[PDB]
């Protein structure tokens, strides 16, 4: 799929992901949710080759849910991100690699800190205040470099995110049909229904 | 580089009547511009009142027929000499073909017989296993020459009743075996004229409740 954005503010992580799905020359769906809840305080968005994205995300989801039941304990966002990276680093040297890029947004309940991890299909992990995959960063990083502060509120984070989407909508040739926005904080995961 | 496939030419034709069915094919076998045989049978009696022809690459066609004949034999062993119905044979053949989805049997297959209500039946396949029951089907080298003729003379397509001027179609009256054999002979005589891979001889297998009957007719040898 096309565009996935992420931003870590003071007390939460915000993920924005496009709604479009295209086969051939036709847009089959304009309300697709490119994300899976890995645990109550960990969300993963994804983008890459057709089919591989969902299969990979659901496979990761199943493994983390299995861990949660076995230990009766939620893994830290850092631990989950490391598990995901290893699976992708394992995948890249397989017969047929999984062509999937992800952002992992989580709230660490132990440290009381939001955390955003960017991982590409090769297994390249980086912790960031804000991140993106593909061409999305080419348009948005200049705005984020300018406006971003670490003490921003969730509402200020959403306003800066709106500005990023507006820039994408102006200068990108592709129509990605807007974005679904989700917030990850101490209370869990919720969706912003109006954006 | 080694090419495992070839083209042995030929053309086949299946037509379903009300209480009978025919499966015809020319007896010429070829490679490129040479003739291998002027009489190499292509349509076979496979048992249980079923006839079959696999047209295209003869080696694959002979293997498929050989396998299906074997499938019929084992169907009798495993299911108390039960008769293999034409619809059950068709489905069985689909699975024989799809077993080689990634190294296909390079053949267009047709079978003919009678359904369980005694009516005439023709089933047609593609090289990878898609099949469907049909009233009329030509397969092989001259398939594109013959099929339109059958659409016109068997299913009365584009034919209307005089005086009405396109308002009322020609009614779909059934054909007799004698009328069908005429259409088959004229189909192959016309195909022989305009297609270089078609000729030498014509062998027709007719299926009725009484059994399987053969008829042979000569064709032009040029």
């Amino acid at each position: 799929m096309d565009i996935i954005l992420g931003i870590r503010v003071q007390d939460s992580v915000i993920l924005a992901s496009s709604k479009a799905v295209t086969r051939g020359i036709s847009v089959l769906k304009d309300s697709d949710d490119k994300t899976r809840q890995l645990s109550p305080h960990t969300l993963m968005s994804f983008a890459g080759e057709a089919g591989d994205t969902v299969q990979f995300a659901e496979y990761i989801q199943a493994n983390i849910q299995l861990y949660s039941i076995r230990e009766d304990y939620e893994l830290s966002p850092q631990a989950v991100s490391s598990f995901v990276r290893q699976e992708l680093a394992k995948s890249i040297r397989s017969r047929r690699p999984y062509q999937v890029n992800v952002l992992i947004g989580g709230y660490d309940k132990k440290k009381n800190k939001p955390e955003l991890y960017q991982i590409d299909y090769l297994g390249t992990k980086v912790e960031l205040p804000y991140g993106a995959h593909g061409y999305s960063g080419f348009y948005t990083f200049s705005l984020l470099d300018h406006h971003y502060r670490p003490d921003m509120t969730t509402e200020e984070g959403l306003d800066l995110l709106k500005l990023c989407v507006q820039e994408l909508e102006k200068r990108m040739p592709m129509d990605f049909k807007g974005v679904i926005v989700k917030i990850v904080d101490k209370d869990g995961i919720r969706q912003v229904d109006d954006f | 580089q080694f090419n495992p496939y070839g083209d042995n030419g030929g053309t086949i034709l299946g037509i379903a009547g009300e209480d009978f069915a025919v499966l015809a094919g020319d007896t010429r076998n070829i490679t490129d511009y040479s003739i291998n045989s002027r009489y190499e049978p292509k349509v076979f009696d496979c048992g249980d009142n079923i006839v079959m022809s696999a047209n295209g690459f003869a080696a694959d066609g002979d293997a498929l027929v050989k396998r299906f004949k074997n499938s019929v034999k084992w169907y009798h062993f495993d299911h108390n000499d039960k008769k293999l119905s034409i619809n059950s044979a068709a489905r069985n053949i689909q699975h024989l073909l799809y077993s080689r989805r990634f190294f296909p049997y390079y053949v267009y297959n047709i079978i003919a017989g009678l359904d369980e209500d005694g009516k005439g039946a023709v089933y047609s396949f593609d090289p990878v296993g898609s099949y469907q029951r049909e009233q009329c089907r030509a397969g092989g080298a001259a398939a594109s020459l013959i099929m339109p003729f059958l659409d016109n003379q068997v299913n009365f397509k584009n034919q209307y009743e005089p005086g009405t001027n396109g308002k009322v179609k020609k009614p779909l009256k059934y054909l007799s075996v004698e009328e069908v054999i005429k259409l088959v002979r004229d189909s192959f005589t016309s195909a022989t004229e305009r297609h270089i891979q078609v000729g030498d001889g014509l062998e027709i297998l007719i299926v009725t409740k009484d059994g399987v009957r053969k008829e042979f007719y000569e064709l032009k040898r040029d």
Binding site: - | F2, Y5, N36, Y39, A59
Partner: protein, 233 residues
């Protein structure tokens, strides 16, 4: 997948009233080089079958051994190995055809074209072709390679259809085969003058003729041909 190295050219054959004839030259070519001049490409199996092979010689020698082993294996625990349960041409052919088609289906073919000629138990004539693709066919006349293009037309003038077989004698059929071999020597650049011929008759059995030569050749008219158009001298 491979490529043929040392090769044998045409094998030709036909049916006549009481049996079959088959012939093939004694050359083993290495591309354009006429490397080996004493190669037998007709291989008898018992006293009722002759297998003629063209194409790769290393694969021919392999097949030659399979057939030799087939005879050995058929004799095992078989008191009627030299009688009712002896090897038939149809058995030998179907075996080879099974092998050829299996090898092509593994993308590792035996780079050959084979003609199995013989006479069955009931006196019926047997003549069938098989090649590296596993393709099989039968006809009153059969030929491989160049023989398909040049020999068949000559042999089909003698036996154009099935009904001409009882009318064709062994003298006429042998004469036609020998003429066809001469024509191939004139026109096939990978052919030789020396050849072998085999007759399998239902009465007189197997006759295997070696060290035959193409004779009665026409070359004299060459003296009169001068230049490529305008040259007179």
């Amino acid at each position: 997948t491979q490529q043929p190295i040392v090769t044998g050219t045409s094998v030709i054959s036909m049916k006549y009233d009481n049996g079959v004839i088959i012939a093939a030259d004694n050359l083993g070519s290495y591309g354009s080089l006429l490397r080996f001049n004493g190669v037998e490409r007709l291989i008898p199996v018992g006293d009722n079958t002759v297998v003629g092979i063209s194409g790769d010689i290393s694969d021919m020698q392999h097949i030659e051994r399979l057939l030799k082993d087939l005879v050995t294996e058929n004799a095992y625990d078989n008191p009627l190995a030299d009688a009712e349960e002896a090897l038939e041409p149809s058995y030998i052919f179907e075996y080879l055809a099974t092998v050829m088609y299996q090898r092509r289906s593994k993308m590792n073919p035996l780079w050959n074209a084979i003609i199995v000629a013989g006479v069955q138990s009931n006196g019926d004539q047997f003549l069938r072709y098989v090649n590296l693709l596993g393709v099989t066919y039968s006809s009153p006349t059969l030929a491989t390679g160049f023989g398909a293009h040049m020999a068949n037309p000559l042999l089909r003038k003698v036996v154009d259809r099935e009904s001409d077989i009882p009318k064709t004698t062994v003298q006429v059929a042998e004469e036609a085969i020998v003429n066809a071999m001469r024509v191939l020597y004139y026109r096939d650049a990978r052919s030789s003058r020396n050849f072998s011929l085999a007759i399998i008759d239902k009465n007189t059995g197997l006759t295997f003729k070696k060290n035959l030569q193409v004779e009665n050749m026409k070359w004299d008219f060459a003296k009169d041909i001068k230049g490529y158009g305008t040259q007179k001298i």
